[PDB]
């Protein structure tokens, strides 16, 4: 009863804050989403206590409109421990206890997007801009990004509608005494025990409890993770965000990379064709033996060039960037007939720019080996903890991970066709569906573009003559989606999966989703100034004046912030030999640093990517500094 009261009250406060945030002015100082509420960047003690007392008095009789509740969730760690213990008990006893058409598994949301204990939004009524915001804005993916704003706001089947119990009714009320009287008021062989988890006079499942207190659990996981999340069977770790999964994956990669005897030691150059040829040859040579054992691993991967001295990790990052950008260029590939001793570009953009899917061709063994090699280099980037910028579509990485592609991946594939099919099915629900279907005269065959292979392919045998009818549209749509998800690119996706698994075990590959894989491989989608601020150390070797070096960093960050996308990518390339920053601090083997050399009028700043450090002179003149930095980052 104690825990239910506290958790319901705190959920009611967080939910009220979220609703008020959504209904308030972001510019007002009292808004939740204001800088003054950062709690780290920046009243009197008497004022704080008076606010707390007034909030307590107001929330007791539902009179808290237009003011945020005053609560400190960081002071509720004991409540978190009690909740974890009770949830462990509930889950343990529950585990001890334990078709087609409209309701098809392909149209149901998977664990990647769904919320535990909450009914997902219907895939048809809500448009794409609200159901799946990530498809409309692909830049929202950040290391600290809420699942709500990525995959829509879930709803819960609660409140008094067909409900006369405390758990069946949502929290709503904000105080701690009404939400304390609510839980009170509601109140053979030995191998067939079959407990029931009665407790609160009803069968209790941990899913509905997790959905009931979703915001509280998210905040607990974000705040209490060094102590509460370290407990056995912790549900904060089980429902952890990107941070826990990425830390676990990086530590597992460190474990898997520190027991091998022989490194990789490739041999590639900086040109276009010979780079690919030597890369394929070396990758084939390294992964070759009679009856190969469980997937072999490389302790280190070093890149050596010809007529270009250089050693370290910066050369490896440059190789990753170059090979990725080469494989993502829309031009005919050089022939690979030397592998054993048709030429469409590998990847194209079906939907939004920047995301690619495999382009099928003649299914030659050379192309399949090339796809296996690109899977291998993706796995190498995973293992070496190096960012290899190749942004694949969500369904491609989903099928690489071995998950099941659902209909909501069509949103990431191509939003326009997603909207068209959604409108088509919404009209199909109406009575005039037959007239529209006969007017457009669909059939179980799709006019695939030359990118997909051209021509026309039949969805099901003897289906060209069979039209698409409202009584059988759903299958059509599914087949439609299927024929643009797995049918056309079965061989390339299988080759990429084989290549990726050739270097990473299946066990570690589990417990990963599309977004986390994208953030670990491709890094952050766009280079952010605050991300650089988070990890950048300044050291000075001049020592001419405190104010000069204090203002030089401010000027540097100001001029960097005013740049655009392409020059920011060029700057990060000239700095760390990789266009995309790592998602978190872990991933930068050296900490990025900037060294302020003694001031000089004409000396363009340098950079060593072996330790990823910039050396910039103390430019007194700002415009000269800008010109020198721009000309330095122009070169590739």
């Amino acid at each position: 009863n104690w825990m239910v009261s506290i958790m319901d009250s705190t959920e009611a406060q967080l939910r009220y804050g979220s609703a008020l945030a959504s209904a308030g002015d972001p510019g007002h100082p009292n808004h939740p989403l204001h800088a003054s509420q950062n709690s780290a960047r920046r009243m009197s003690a008497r004022g704080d206590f008076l606010n707390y007392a007034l909030s307590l008095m107001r929330s007791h009789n539902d009179e808290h409109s237009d003011v945020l509740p005053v609560l400190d969730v960081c002071s509720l760690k004991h409540v978190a421990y009690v909740f974890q213990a009770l949830i462990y008990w509930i889950k343990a006893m529950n585990q001890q206890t334990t078709e087609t058409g409209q309701n098809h598994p392909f149209f149901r949301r998977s664990d990647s997007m769904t919320f535990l204990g909450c009914i997902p939004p219907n895939p048809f009524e809500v448009p794409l801009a609200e159901a799946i915001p990530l498809a409309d804005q692909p830049h929202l993916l950040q290391p600290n990004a809420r699942k709500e704003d990525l995959f829509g706001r879930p709803s819960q089947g609660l409140y008094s509608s067909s409900a006369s119990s405390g758990k069946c009714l949502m929290e709503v009320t904000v105080d701690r005494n009404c939400l304390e009287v609510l839980p009170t008021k509601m109140s053979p062989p030995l191998t067939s025990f079959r407990p029931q988890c009665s407790f609160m006079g009803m069968v209790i499942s941990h899913d509905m409890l997790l959905g009931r207190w979703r915001l509280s659990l998210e905040l607990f996981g974000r705040v209490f993770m060094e102590d509460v999340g370290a407990e056995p069977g912790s549900i904060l770790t089980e429902l952890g965000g990107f941070e826990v999964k990425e830390s676990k994956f990086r530590r597992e990669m460190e474990k898997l990379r520190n027991q091998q005897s022989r490194d990789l030691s490739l041999e590639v150059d900086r040109d276009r064709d010979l780079l690919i040829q030597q890369t394929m040859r070396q990758l084939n040579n390294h992964f070759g033996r009679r009856c190969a054992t469980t997937p072999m691993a490389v302790h280190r991967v070093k890149v050596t060039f010809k007529d270009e001295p250089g050693e370290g990790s910066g050369v490896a990052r440059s190789f990753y960037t170059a090979i990725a950008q080469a494989f993502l260029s829309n031009e005919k590939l050089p022939n690979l007939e030397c592998i054993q001793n048709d030429n469409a570009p590998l990847f194209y953009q079906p939907g939004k720019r920047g995301f690619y899917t495999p382009r099928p061709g003649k299914n030659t063994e050379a192309r399949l080996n090339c796809f296996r090699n690109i899977g291998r280099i993706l796995g190498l980037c995973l293992l070496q903890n190096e960012l290899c910028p190749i942004t694949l579509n969500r369904h491609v990485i989903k099928v690489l991970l071995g998950r099941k592609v659902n209909w909501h991946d069509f949103a990431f594939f191509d939003p326009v066709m997603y909207e068209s099919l959604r409108q088509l099915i919404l009209a199909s629900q109406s009575s005039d569906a037959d007239a529209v279907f006969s007017a457009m005269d669909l059939a179980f065959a799709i006019d695939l573009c030359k990118e997909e292979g051209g021509g026309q392919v039949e969805l099901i045998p003897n289906g060209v003559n069979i039209p698409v009818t409202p009584q059988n549209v759903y299958e059509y749509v599914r087949k439609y989606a299927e024929h643009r998800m797995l049918v056309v690119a079965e061989q390339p996706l299988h080759a990429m999966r084989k290549g990726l698994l050739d270097v990473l075990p299946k066990n570690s590959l589990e417990d990963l989703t599309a977004e986390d894989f994208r953030l670990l491989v491709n890094g952050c989608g766009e280079v952010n100034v605050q991300m650089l601020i988070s990890f950048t150390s300044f050291n000075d070797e001049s020592g001419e004046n405190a104010e000069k070096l204090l203002q030089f960093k401010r000027w540097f960050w100001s001029i960097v912030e005013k740049m655009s996308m392409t020059e920011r990518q060029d700057l990060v390339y000239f700095w760390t030999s990789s266009p995309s920053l790592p998602a978190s601090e872990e991933g930068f083997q050296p900490m990025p640093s900037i060294t302020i050399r003694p001031p000089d009028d004409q000396h363009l700043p340098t950079a060593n990517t072996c330790i990823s450090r910039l050396y910039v002179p103390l430019y007194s003149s700002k415009q000269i500094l800008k010109q020198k930095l721009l000309l330095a980052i122009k070169t590739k």
Binding site: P32, S39, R42, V73, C74, V223, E226, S537, M591
Partner: protein, 96 residues
């Protein structure tokens, strides 16, 4: 006049800055101790209880003290007083 921070390795105590931007209002971090807040809330409760006690003490002489002197007073009967005392006792049972 109020600048930001551009550095690294600034981690003293901490454990609360990891909260999402949407919920930073629900998170903090001269003393900021639990016992001070408990004592202050108990003091406020004591003030309210003293006021309740004074009002209940004015009931037997309500007509002489409150009704005649104050221009606007609420008529009070015996059954109202006994129900009032029962209500106050029932409300104070848990803290008792």
């Amino acid at each position: 006049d109020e600048p930001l921070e551009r550095t690294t390795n600034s981690s003293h105590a901490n454990g609360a800055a990891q909260a999402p931007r949407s919920m930073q209002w629900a998170v903090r971090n001269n003393a900021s101790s639990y016992l001070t807040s408990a004592s202050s809330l108990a003091r406020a409760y004591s003030i309210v209880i003293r006021q309740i006690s004074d009002l209940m003490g004015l009931i037997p002489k309500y007509n002489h003290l409150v009704y005649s002197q104050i221009p606007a007073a609420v008529k009070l009967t015996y059954q109202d007083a006994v129900n009032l005392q029962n209500y106050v006792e029932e409300k104070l049972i848990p803290t008792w």
